[PDB]
Design a protein around this ligand. Structure first.
Ligand SMILES: O=C(O)[C@@H](O)C(O)[C@H](O)C(=O)O
Ligand SMILES: O=C(O)[C@@H](O)C(O)[C@H](O)C(=O)O
Ligand SMILES: O=C(O)[C@@H](O)C(O)[C@H](O)C(=O)O
Ligand SMILES: [Cl-]
Ligand code: NA
Ligand code: NA
Ligand SMILES: [Zn+2]
Ligand SMILES: [Zn+2]
Ligand SMILES: [Zn+2]
Lengths: 413, 413, 413
């Protein structure tokens, strides 16, 4: 029987370690989609989180950086972030965890040898390896139909294998309608100059067509700190007249990732986005006024985390998830997970990887599971000491909810 | 209900600490007996355990040491074992535990201040204080009629107060009969040169007379590693024809402390005794052949401990007790108590203090109770793990047995 | 590759728990042999280990005890060792582990209900249940052709099923030749009043006849602490001229369980045996002088354990096994298993149950595996900290050797 923090630590850690993970938000693709699925050590080293970091050290111009080959960029980052200074940051630590996880050894610092490992495998093979090592059963992708390369793959028949699920990303539609409406037109969607019946209907058609073609687990959009709702604006009207009605009809959750201020440093590309605290008014309104709609929410500002937890206490149609981007660091993951469990028990999704490069599934879940297990141990122990019987089966059940079931239960799959 | 090892631990520790102790073997005396009762920091520091230890470091010759005054010997020991080297030995640690328990501060290393504490009170006052701090309700003395000093107190009609009990110590009679018989004659005991009926009867009379004057809880003797029985020697015959039959008639247990090899280093005085493993044959014979006699046994050799425990499994007229002298060290107390509990459950007496100096009751019991508590927590945890539901009252009961009731139940008092 | 002590511990414990056990020494019999196979709660409670323990507490005379029915004895032991005092001894804890393993609940202390469970089952079923619960694949019995109740079955053709193996126990022959000599004649073995070629041939024929009837994995005998060899005694001659020769020929090992001092307390029956430290001279002689003979050895004295391990280091034809009887207590099992692994790696057999009652296989292996796993985790962790990388397969392999392969490999089966 589990009758001490010591036995508890053992059971919890084992349960967490053995629980297959459903990664509900990533930038990975089923291997049959091709090269869009990034992987290998050079890709890990050139992850944009690492581009931002190397630029704080190297004297090579950002322009010169983008001009180098992938291998050259990787060589530079390795030398600047791993050799010239100890790789202590979270993103650098992650690269090492991945290598060790693959059987490669960071002690040697033999980059050439690590590279040899990857050249000997196919995409299909590396996916099987990585999903096994990271114990991830399901991967949710981010499928942006506005990206020419992605759209053609879907239009030409590409479908993910059983382990990869789609999520319809709509940033261009919702945040750049003035420009995007012209593309909807090129694609046969007759949106008009004014927002009238015809425009509303065609935007719905667009959403419906893609829901049918992608069979997404949810519709998603990343939003700025200034997001508000209701709002007389293109975003405001599209959400109100098109997105919500359609999402309700197909019982598809609407995922909002709030807090990103795009391109504050355009030259850094993907590494050029910033963060800002958002008002909770828009979210509060959506939850209260659309009781039949489901919402998956994660926010970027550290200062929004606690009030977001309280908001989840108010609305059952709100399911909060992950420690997103700038929140995805040990110090923050820890405080967020503890505040969440303290006020929500197990009714939340603690994490997602946001993996852009296959191997990252290894370090993201490993780093995150160690922290989540420690939180669980403290919480199980507090009730154990209070006289509660905690069984191994109940721990497995709760751990299953957090890493996989709560999500599928929420999305209705 | 005790739902966790953590709660079990605190309940066990509380029970053990709160249980009044019957110390069944000491070298302390009821206060009304006089200066025979030793106490205070100078007495603590000149304990022969510390004398043997200081001679391993000091340049002072043993002759000179014995020549010094109490105070001077104590200053030498304090300086050599506490200041020049850290006082990490069990005996030195004990001195510090006593000091702290009395409210003094070891951190200052102010020996003069410590001495001032003791000069401020009377023997009766210190006895009340110490017995309170060490939570000792009953003390069993070692009463030797062959020691001129002690004998006079008894002949004077002095009686120990209710907190002190007598035990008739017989080493001289049993181990040095050839010399001792001449003293018995001087006392009116007409023992002959030949071991005839008259000699036997006079020796029994000597025993009966002191049993009447002291009303001892048991008769005792310390024996050498070569102890044997039956044996055609004064010791073997005195035990066979006098000691055992008298012990039976009075239903008084016979305590045998086996394993000491006396005076291997004469100049060290009380600090000059050694140890040796003994044969279990004599004890086995006594137990089997004298079923109506009760025996209290403790052995000096580490190598005799396990077989002594097995012998206890064989004979109910055998009660084993304590971790004697060279066995009275944490490492040994722990292995001994665990072997004993695993093969005897709670049917034994784990410890006695053997205190020669009053204050020692504090550390002797503090150090032992913590070890005994840890052993109990493990054993209790193991059966909680097996589904047994131990109650707090059952824990207090077992603790009372181990620290007090088992002894009184065995001596029939 | 295990990178953490947590993953190591999980894997080791899993390996240990799942590893089918080969119990190379018990006092159980294949169920087709009849009532000779003891089982059920009353048999557990009346195990002689508990008879010895209850006698240290109960007012009931040993005479009265033997006169009571099995149920009454069981009731008495339960009240005296489990109710009046916490059942903390190893043997008492063992009874509780057995009950819990069978799904019964120790918390209710309902002996009436526990008994009902066994009443509604057959020997065959319980054997299936227990061997399954205790994960024991093979059981080596102790087969004594001198016991009338057992011999009848062997003579009437009864053969144990494939899960039970035989061991030819020869105590009467080797230790009581003078009284056994006459039983051989009565069976057709013409041994003469003197040790001549005729006697040697008849004894050898006796061994050979039974080795033929039993096909035992080895021949065994328990010896006293005084055992020596060579020796001009019936035992010393039978071993030198008969046992060893027949052993080498059929290539079957000779198991010597040394250290038991028989019936030091006759009235206790099976609970009346004591222990003593033996000389190693005899075992050393046999190993050196009989290179072509296999010897399985276990010793009763705590004081023989370390030197026995060192002796195993000297001779490969020596296989030490288990923590026998009075050694079968956690404190000793732990020190023995650690000394053994430290000086012999995995080249030894850690444990055997010595079960006299069927269900004991549950607690004996549960209590023992628990300890062995801890030792393994510590030893594996030490090399891991040294840089060694152990695989789960190497662990399952090592665990296989300890609990089964080492034995079968030594016996040559
Ligand atoms: O790597 C990231 O986390 C960002 O660059 C984005 O992918 C962000 O997670 C998003 O989904 O908008
Ligand atoms: O202080 C001691 O333990 C010894 O010097 C003796 O008193 C011994 O305990 C004994 O009782 O003979
Ligand atoms: O139960 C026991 O362990 C003993 O009584 C004997 O069976 C001993 O193990 C032996 O086999 O000689
Ligand atoms: Cl020894
Ligand atoms: Na904090
Ligand atoms: Na030890
Ligand atoms: Zn993302
Ligand atoms: Zn003493
Ligand atoms: Zn046996």
């Amino acid at each position: 029987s589990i009758n001490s923090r010591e036995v508890l630590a053992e059971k919890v850690k084992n349960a967490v370690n053995n629980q297959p993970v459903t990664d509900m938000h990533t930038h990975l693709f089923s291997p049959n989609f091709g090269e869009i699925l990034l992987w290998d050590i050079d890709e890990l080293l050139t992850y944009h989180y690492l581009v931002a970091e190397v630029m704080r050290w190297t004297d090579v111009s950002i322009e010169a950086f983008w001009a180098m080959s992938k291998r050259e960029q990787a060589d530079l980052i390795w030398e600047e972030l791993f050799i010239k200074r100890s790789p202590v940051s979270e993103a650098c630590r992650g690269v090492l965890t991945c290598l060790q996880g693959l059987g490669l050894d960071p002690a040697t610092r033999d980059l050439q040898v690590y590279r040899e490992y990857f050249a000997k495998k196919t995409s299909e093979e590396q996916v099987d390896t990585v999903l096994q090592l990271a114990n991830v059963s399901d991967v949710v992708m981010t499928n942006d139909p506005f990206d020419d390369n992605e759209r053609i793959s879907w239009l030409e028949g590409k479908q993910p294998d059983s382990r990869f699920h789609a999520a319809l990303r709509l940033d261009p539609l919702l945040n750049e309608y003035e420009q995007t409406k012209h593309r909807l037109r090129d694609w046969g969607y007759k949106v008009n100059d004014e927002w009238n019946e015809g425009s509303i209907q065609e935007v719905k058609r667009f959403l419906t067509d893609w829901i049918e073609r992608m069979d997404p687990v949810y519709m998603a959009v990343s939003l700025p700190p200034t997001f508000s709702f209701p709002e007389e604006s293109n975003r405001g009207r599209i959400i109100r007249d098109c997105l919500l009605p359609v999402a309700e009809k197909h019982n598809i959750p609407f995922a909002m990732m709030i807090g990103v201020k795009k391109r504050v440093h355009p030259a850094l590309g993907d590494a050029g986005d910033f963060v800002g605290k958002a008002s909770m008014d828009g979210v509060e309104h959506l939850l209260r006024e659309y009781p039949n709609n489901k919402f998956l929410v994660t926010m970027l500002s550290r200062e929004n985390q606690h009030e977001l937890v309280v908001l989840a206490r108010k609305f059952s149609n709100l399911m909060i998830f992950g420690c997103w981007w700038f929140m995805n660091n040990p110090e923050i993951i820890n405080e967020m997970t503890r505040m969440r469990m303290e006020m929500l028990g197990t009714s939340f999704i603690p994490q997602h990887s946001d993996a852009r490069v296959l191997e990252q599934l290894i370090y993201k879940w490993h780093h995150s599971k160690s922290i989540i297990a420690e939180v669980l141990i403290d919480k199980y122990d507090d009730i154990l000491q209070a006289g509660w019987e905690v069984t191994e089966e109940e721990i497995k059940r709760d751990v299953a909810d957090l890493f996989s079931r709560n999500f599928w239960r929420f999305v209705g799959r």
